[PDB]
Ligand binder design. Structure first.
Ligand SMILES: OC[C@H]1O[C@H](OC[C@H]2O[C@H](OC[C@H]3O[C@H](O)[C@H](O)[C@@H](O)[C@@H]3O)[C@H](O)[C@@H](O)[C@@H]2O)[C@H](O)[C@@H](O)[C@@H]1O
Ligand SMILES: [Ca+2]
Lengths: 1271, 148, 80
């Protein structure tokens, strides 16, 4: 690694890490390439190295297989250049040879691996055509080249050809597409209905054999077999289970001792697949029945099953564990046989219980078996990964279902996706509906009781020190709102108004700015909503973060021009000379125009950044681990050791002196240079750009540290007043002289324009202030000899001497700490610093220096960067503006973008990928306390600390674990109020960042150093709740919209939704609301937008449960883990003895099961003994049936329409089905009605409408809206 | 640890336990995909993870291919990444070139100081002689690069 | 020819191509001639060479059926 690729005269050269031009065969970064004696690279040709004859590809130049004509003859070769023997090879033109034992190609007919193939006179393989080998005529397949039956059109009549090349007479024969035909004694294909060998087949107009096709063929119904297309009468019932009684001598023994929670393991009264129960008696040791004692629980599946399919699987599985004769049982097996077999397994079970003196072994056997079954694992949960589903595999929305699951009813709350732009639900039908579901258990923030609890938490954090240590200096000052677009936007108003009430943030800039607060608000329309609502918290500015991506930070070669930073479209016709603002553009552009910002037009206050803990970090760091085989998927679970190893590669790539970056970001110093000089923004700095993102906190600085540190201290000293920004560029494309080098300038304290010469207040602060920034994205940039580049430092800086702070070159970026050690340069009369291709600068006393305006490439830059400041700056010079106590504004708003707000800098002082502390002394917050000084002097006014909440860790109740959780970063937590408290046994129990004391000391230390502390407010979700409940759940995408092809709708599901109730959420939950309602009544009386209601503190949340949640990620338990009778579709329950529903076997009643005919029709009874009504039922041979409300199977009559419309208790199944005379539902096939119209019915039996439909043989058909087939 | 073809000519791979593989799997160098039922995807695209990958008709192996997105041809490499500033093939065997903006190029094109000829359809033409710069030019059988 | 005779132990086994210089091939044919005359004296016979030449000659496409367009359709099925 570490050598660049260069192109000279049309050819690729490779120059080493050494700096040497490369000849010969070389494996460079896992690719095998060759360079001739001049050092040019070879593509699409063969070369000889050692005794190897190696071909290299024509695109890539990479070693791969080919055929060379060597002397007279063809010879195959592999990737390493070895002559191939007894192998296929494809050559450059996609042609195929087979070389034998001697390396010589086979010619003519041959058989290989049981496949018959042909080769032309040159040894090339014939594919996709006929061929007259010998006397006969054979077709060979397109890709494999294998001999197969095919048809060709001779004269105007189709003819058939078999695999041996013989024409077909009196038989069926296929074509390559997959259609079967039949050809008579005279070789001609047959049409229409045909009876051959005592069986009848249906061939359409085209002569295609139709299989799984229902139609009235003799004027009498006929279904054509899916296997061979042979017509059955569909009069014989296909079900193989007659009505039988199940009761026997064991029934009363295995029956439940009680029909209630005593004798049944349950959740909210319901039963699950792995429920154990208390049978009346126990066949102890397989010998003697003995009454059971309370502790003698046994698995429900020893005695009961939902259907015969499941029963048969259980028996086979338990057999395989040594418990019985190993058996192949199917759903077709007679019920009697299965039940007898279940008892001999029961016997064996009781024997192994006595032998082992344990039931744990069984628990584990049952668990294993249960997850085998599709209804009891994720397969019935429709895992998907598009959208935010990418994180966890998909989501379930809980439903208000007072009849079945009343503890889980939310009281008609659960308004989903009430993001800012959809706070009133007016975009619920569009993509403008918010993605309410993100991670773990999503909290219902549309419920006023929950809203009140979020405020209690908010108060708790803002007064954390007062509450937990009676230390009024250990309290958080502001907040970051995590996942704004995934929650009900009411939370913003709740938070905003709280800050107004307690801190008078809407009074003045000084009050507002004392409690700096930010939003993670990614939607492109969030900034303007936030501004309409008075900027209670600062929006992010993605438009600038975005442009850094395109123009500097992301990629090599192609990048958007620096021109794009201007957003000239801001002005009408992009006329910088005339500068008329465009009042009505397509709602686009960068948030704050900086072409000529004199502070005269008000703008939206904001924070901005280059990177974040969750931007340009998470993905790169994992791509690095993937690329080095440490994990396979982005979602994969990894250990800390796995992370540390991957981090070494990430670091190695970051600091690569080559200057190329695979995972890391380019031009970071240059990006920060712009960020930290921009007017009308509060910049934020990412810990991971200053120190390494892995390992210990502040363990090692990054390579960018000194440059960014310098920029930061200089920002205090020089950054103030108006701004200008221009580029040596007019658009996408560059004219001759043009460099596309950007120039950004700030003038000084009261100087707002280029041409302004002095302040209005006649303060002189401005003279030694101001700054010049030049940046390029082109590391191969070379200037014309004529060309000059100019920084208009302004007419307030005529004839002044300026000195460099920071200058790029070919080995790095030099940083100058003071005026003396840096090159100076003086401005002209108009105040411009002029630069040429070649420059000769003079130090103020020390020396004379040479410097080229040259694009460079190294670890610290891929482009140009120069920063210049005025010499003669005082030691304590401070260009910041303090915020005023006066009520400047009656606009209602909290924050205002001005010089005072711009005097802030936020430091996001953590990384998600930090290692766990090796010792108490190195914990992040311990370190922050000792190092607070350092950040004061970089100008940080607010320190954004990680989320301090106790990690849910490795705990995982089902479904996909997330990295937040297993990396303990604090975004995944179980207890919202536990910020590092000790165990109740007295022992320390720090978070990743340290104990609660460590945190309070860290916060105080920041206040002692004049900095604020930001609390991460995470209201969207909570992880790993230990208590289970039964919810009613529907499968949904991020926006809470039901998946289109899902039968998982309003199903009962066991979720983990209930908190421990003996945690810190229980201690501190709701406590402070009463105090606050008394003190600030209006907060509790003010209506919220999304609900029309005020917050409701009448109910306190000490323990979470499902009624307060919108849903969960899928937990891999199954759609029917909660047990149900297929016949009535009623779920089993034992909560209240007045409304018990169990299988009759467990109640020692007689459960009859099977199909039984009577004069009216056919009825069916489930294993649990109940009659099928208004439900679909599947028999042991895989056929499906529908039983109407009356309890009778639907079946077609002679002369009547077989198509029947169904409306069932199970709504998802509603639709039009085709039932045959024996009740069988047609599936995945065409069905004719009484009138001769054809329809199609899908995988699940439903009619299909208004779409084209494809065939495995490439036949296409169309179905009209009314269902009929146009074809 | 073997492939099996069923009645319909569909293909599964069963692992060490006899149980079918699901999702993305690497058999030796070869990269393949398997649906939720364990069936091997052959002759079609597939959105595995973040990216989008075409799998070959009979081998089922991951390879470069082109599809028409909106009204413009786009190129897809073997890793499922769309192609920008490079040549990429399609399964048929044609090579195309896609510029910085991902759009296929047409006509005579000079790239990295060499000249290649792309026809109306965007196919790179090899072993093609013609008066291209108003001056004779033979395009290489190897790489399609113009020689004098 | 040079490659074939080489493979029988008569010279350094070689990949020679039509691209190889005429000079090199002619030099190499003589070192093969030398090796040939040695095995003629050593064996006191030329039959071994007759069989070697026969074999080599049929190696070449112009001197075997490949330039004869073997076919088997019609009565050509009998003898090619
Ligand atoms: O054992 C499997 C199979 O092997 C051969 O067919 C493979 C394959 O060959 C061709 O495609 C290969 C591909 O190779 C390089 O990438 C070339 O540069 C390409 O042009 C070329 O397409 C052929 O096009 C395919 O149809 C074929 O599937 C044997 O031919 C088979 O008999 C054998 O079963
Ligand atoms: Ca949410």
């Amino acid at each position: 690694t570490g050598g660049h690729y260069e192109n000279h005269n049309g050819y690729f050269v490779y120059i080493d890490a050494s700096g040497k031009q490369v000849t010969g065969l070389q494996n460079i970064d896992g690719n095998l390439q060759y360079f001739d004696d001049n050092g040019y690279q070879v593509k699409g040709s063969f070369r000889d190295v050692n005794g190897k004859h190696i071909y290299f590809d024509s695109v890539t130049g990479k070693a791969s297989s080919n055929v060379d004509i060597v002397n007279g003859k063809a010879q195959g070769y592999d990737a390493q250049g070895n002559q191939l023997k007894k192998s296929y090879v494809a050559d450059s033109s996609g042609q195929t040879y087979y070389f034998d034992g001697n390396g010589q190609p086979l010619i003519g007919l041959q058989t290989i691996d049981g496949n018959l193939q042909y080769f032309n006179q040159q040894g090339v393989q014939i594919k996709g055509g006929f061929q007259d080998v010998n006397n006969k005529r054979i077709y060979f397949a397109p890709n494999t080249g294998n001999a197969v039956a095919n048809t060709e059109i001779i004269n105007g009549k189709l003819q058939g050809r078999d695999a041996n090349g013989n024409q077909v007479k009196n038989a069926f024969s296929k074509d390559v597409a997959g259609n079967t035909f039949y050809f008579d004694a005279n070789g001609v294909m047959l049409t229409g209905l045909q009876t051959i060998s005592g069986k009848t087949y249906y061939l359409d107009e085209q002569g295609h054999l139709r299989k799984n096709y229902a139609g009235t063929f003799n004027n009498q119904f006929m279904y054509f077999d899916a296997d061979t297309g042979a017509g059955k009468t569909a009069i014989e019932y296909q079900f193989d289970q007659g009505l039988v009684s199940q009761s026997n001598e064991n029934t009363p023994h295995n029956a439940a001792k009680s029909y209630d929670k005593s004798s049944f393991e349950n959740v909210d009264g319901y039963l699950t697949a792995d429920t154990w129960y208390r049978p009346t008696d126990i066949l102890k040791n397989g010998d003697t029945w003995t009454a059971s004692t309370e502790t003698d629980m046994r698995p429900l599946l020893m005695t009961w099953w939902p259907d015969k399919q499941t029963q048969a699987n259980y028996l086979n599985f338990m057999s395989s564990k040594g418990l019985g004769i190993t058996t192949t049982y199917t759903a077709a097996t007679s019920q009697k046989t299965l039940n007898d077999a279940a008892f001999v397994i029961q016997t064996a079970i009781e024997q192994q219980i006595s032998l082992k003196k344990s039931t744990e072994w069984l628990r584990d056997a049952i668990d294993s078996f249960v997850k085998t079954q599709a209804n009891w694992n994720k397969q019935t949960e429709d895992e998907a990964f598009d959208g935010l589903q990418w994180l966890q595999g998909g989501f379930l929305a809980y439903q208000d279902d007072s009849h079945r699951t009343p503890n889980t009813d939310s009281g008609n709350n659960r308004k989903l996706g009430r993001q800012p732009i959809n706070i009133d639900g007016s975009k619920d039908t569009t993509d403008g509906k918010g993605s309410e579901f993100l991670l773990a258990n999503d909290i219902d923030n549309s419920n006023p009781i929950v809203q009140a609890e979020q405020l209690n938490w908010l108060h708790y954090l803002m007064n954390f020190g007062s509450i937990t240590g009676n230390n009024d200096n250990a309290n958080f000052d502001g907040i970051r709102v995590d996942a704004v677009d995934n929650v009900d936007a009411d939370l913003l108003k709740i938070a905003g108004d709280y800050f107004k009430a307690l801190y008078g943030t809407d009074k003045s800039d000084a009050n507002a700015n004392k409690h700096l607060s930010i939003l993670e608000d990614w939607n492109g329309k969030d900034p303007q909503y936030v501004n309409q609502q008075g900027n209670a918290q600062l929006t992010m500015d993605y438009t600038v973060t975005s442009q850094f991506g395109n123009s500097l930070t992301h990629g090599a070669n192609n990048r958007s021009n620096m021109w794009y930073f201007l957003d000239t479209g801001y002005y009408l016709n992009g006329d910088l000379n005339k500068k008329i603002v465009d009042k009505n553009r397509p709602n686009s552009g960068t948030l704050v125009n900086r072409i000529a910002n004199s502070g005269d037009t008000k703008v939206i206050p904001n924070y901005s950044f280059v990177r974040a803990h969750d931007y340009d970090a998470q993905d790169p760091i994992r791509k690095a681990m993937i690329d080095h085989g440490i994990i396979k998927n982005m979602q994969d679970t990894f250990t800390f050791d796995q992370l540390a190893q991957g981090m070494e590669f990430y670091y190695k790539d970051q600091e690569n002196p080559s200057g190329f970056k695979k995972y890391n970001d380019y031009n970071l110093p240059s990006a920060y240079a712009m960020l930290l000089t921009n007017k009308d923004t509060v910049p934020r700095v990412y810990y991971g750009d200053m120190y390494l993102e892995g390992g210990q906190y502040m363990e090692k600085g990054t390579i960018y540290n000194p440059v960014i540190s310098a920029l930061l201290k200089a920002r205090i000293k020089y950054v103030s007043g108006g701004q200008t920004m221009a580029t040596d560029s007019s658009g996408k494309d560059l004219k001759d002289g043009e460099t596309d080098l950007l120039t950004s300038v700030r003038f000084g304290k009261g100087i707002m324009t280029s041409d302004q010469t002095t302040t209005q207040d006649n303060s002189q602060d401005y003279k030694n202030q101001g700054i010049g920034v030049i940046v390029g994205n082109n590391p191969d940039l070379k200037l014309n000899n004529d060309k000059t580049i100019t920084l208009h430092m302004g007419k307030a800086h005529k004839n002044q001497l300026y000195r460099a702070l920071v200058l790029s070159n070919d080995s790095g970026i030099d940083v100058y700490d003071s005026d003396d050690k840096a090159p100076t340069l003086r401005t002209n009369d108009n105040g411009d610093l002029i630069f040429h291709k070649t420059n000769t600068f003079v130090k103020q006393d020390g020396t004379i220096i040479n410097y080229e305006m040259k694009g460079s490439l190294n670890a610290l830059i891929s482009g140009y960067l120069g920063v210049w400041v005025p010499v003669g700056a005082s030691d304590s010079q401070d260009a910041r503006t303090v915020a005023t106590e006066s009520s400047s504004s009656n606009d209602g708003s909290v924050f205002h973008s001005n010089a005072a707000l711009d005097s802030n800098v936020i430091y996001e002082g953590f990384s998600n990928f930090q290692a766990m502390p090796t010792s108490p002394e190195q914990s992040t917050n311990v370190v922050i306390a000792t190092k607070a000084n350092l950040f004061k002097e970089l100008g940080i006014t607010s320190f954004e600390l990680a989320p301090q909440y106790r990690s849910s860790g490795d705990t995982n109740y089902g479904g996909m674990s997330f990295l937040d959780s297993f990396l303990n970063n604090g975004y995944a937590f179980t207890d919202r109020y536990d910020l590092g408290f000790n165990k109740a046994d007295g022992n320390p129990n720090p978070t990743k960042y340290g104990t609660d004391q460590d945190l309070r000391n860290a916060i105080e230390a920041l206040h002692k150093n004049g900095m604020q502390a930001i609390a991460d407010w995470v209201p969207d979700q909570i992880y790993a709740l230990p208590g289970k409940e039964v919810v009613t759940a529907t499968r949904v995408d991020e926006r809470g919209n039901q998946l289109k092809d899902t039968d998982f709708v309003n199903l009962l599901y066991v979720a983990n939704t209930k908190s421990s109730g003996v945690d810190y959420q229980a201690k501190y939950g709701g406590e402070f609301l009463d105090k606050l309602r008394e003190e600030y009544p209006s907060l509790f009386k003010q209506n919220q937008v999304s609900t029309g209601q005020p917050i409701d503190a009448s109910t306190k949340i000490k323990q979470w449960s499902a009624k307060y949640m919108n849903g969960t990620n899928i937990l891999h338990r199954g759609a029917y883990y909660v047990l149900k009778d297929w016949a009535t579709n009623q779920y089993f329950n034992i909560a209240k003895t007045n409304e018990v529903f169990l299988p009759l076997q467990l109640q020692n009643k007689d459960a009859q099961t099977g199909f039984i005919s009577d004069a009216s029709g056919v009825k069916y009874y489930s294993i649990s003994g109940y009659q099928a009504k208004d439900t679909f039922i599947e028999d042991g041979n895989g056929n499906w049936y529908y039983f109407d409300k009356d309890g009778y199977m639907v079946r077609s009559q002679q002369g009547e329409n077989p198509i029947r419309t169904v409306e069932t208790s199970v709504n998802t199944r509603n639709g039009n089905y085709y039932f045959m005379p024996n009740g069988v539902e047609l599936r995945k096939g065409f069905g004719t009605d009484n009138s001769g119209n054809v329809y199609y019915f899908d995988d699940q039996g439903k009619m299909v409408r208004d779409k084209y439909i494809n065939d495995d043989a490439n036949n296409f058909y169309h179905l009209n809206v009314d269902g009929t087939m146009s074809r």
